[PDB]
Symmetry: C2
């Protein structure tokens, strides 16, 4: 059993998706701004 469970899961699964998208964006940002 988890403590937060709902409060955590409610904003966990969807977070992973958003995080991935943002992560990739960061990579491009750095590259595009190399020189």
């Amino acid at each position: 059993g988890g403590i937060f469970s709902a409060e955590f899961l409610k904003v966990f699964l969807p977070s992973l998706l958003l995080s991935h998208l943002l992560a990739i964006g960061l990579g491009i940002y750095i590259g595009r701004r190399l020189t």
Copy 2:
């Protein structure tokens, strides 16, 4: 409880971390490729 739980989780937590790292890496590769 569930069948795996411990085992499954043992190979689920460290995955999220690796995913994030890889995600950012991909983004960079794309950017540096265009520039």
